[PDB]
């Protein structure tokens, strides 16, 4: 399927979650989070046809709308369907607080 386990296993031309490690401060420069340095936010690119994991009904109508005309830039938009939390540690003024951001990671993409 279009998960982070099947994408880093073989090749493909349709959507496919690729690696996207994000260092909280290096890429996002987030100042409200101290640890961890970052995490594997993962992500997905490439277009999405029909059968390729369809979420909404319009995901299959437009998916073909493009698969029919070569050069149409109105294709669908593969995205992160299921996500994952994220154990971090920030500071409120001077008190340390470890939490677990929700849906801050990608576990599999589909086609919204």
**Which C-beta is closer to a copy of itself: that of 6 or that of 21?**
21
For 59-99, list the strands marked E by DSSP: 80-87, 90-92, 95-97
Q: What are phi and psi of 67, to 5 degrees?
A: -55, -15
Single out the residue of 31, 74, 92, 95 in contact with a copy of itself (rule: CB under 8 A).
Answer: 74
Which among 103, 7, 83, 82 has a CA at the least distance from the CA of 46?
Answer: 7
Single out the residue of 14, 18, 34, 90 in contact with a copy of itself (rule: CB under 8 A).
Answer: 18
Single out the residue of 69, 71, 92, 93 in contact with a copy of itself (rule: CB under 8 A).
Answer: 69
The answer to whether 52 and 15 are in contact (CB under 8 A) is yes
> Is 66 in a helix, a strand, or coil?
helix
In the complex, minimum distance from the CB of residue 49 to a copy of itself, in angstroms, rounded to a whole number: 12
Could you list the residues that contact a copy of itself (CB under 8 A)?
18, 20, 22, 27-30, 41, 43-45, 56-59, 61-62, 64-65, 68-69, 73-74, 76-81, 83, 101-106, 112
């Amino acid at each position: 399927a279009l998960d982070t386990n099947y994408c880093f296993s073989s090749t493909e031309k349709n959507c496919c979650v690729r690696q996207l490690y994000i260092d909280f401060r290096k890429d996002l420069g987030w100042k409200w989070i101290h640890e961890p340095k970052g995490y594997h936010a993962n992500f997905c690119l490439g277009p999405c046809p029909y059968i390729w994991s369809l979420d909404t009904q319009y995901s299959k109508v437009l998916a073909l709308y493009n698969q029919h005309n070569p050069g149409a830039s109105a294709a669908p938009c593969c995205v992160p369907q299921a996500l994952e939390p994220l154990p971090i540690v920030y500071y409120v003024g001077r008190k340390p607080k470890v939490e677990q951001l929700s849906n801050m990671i990608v576990r599999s993409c589909k086609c919204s």
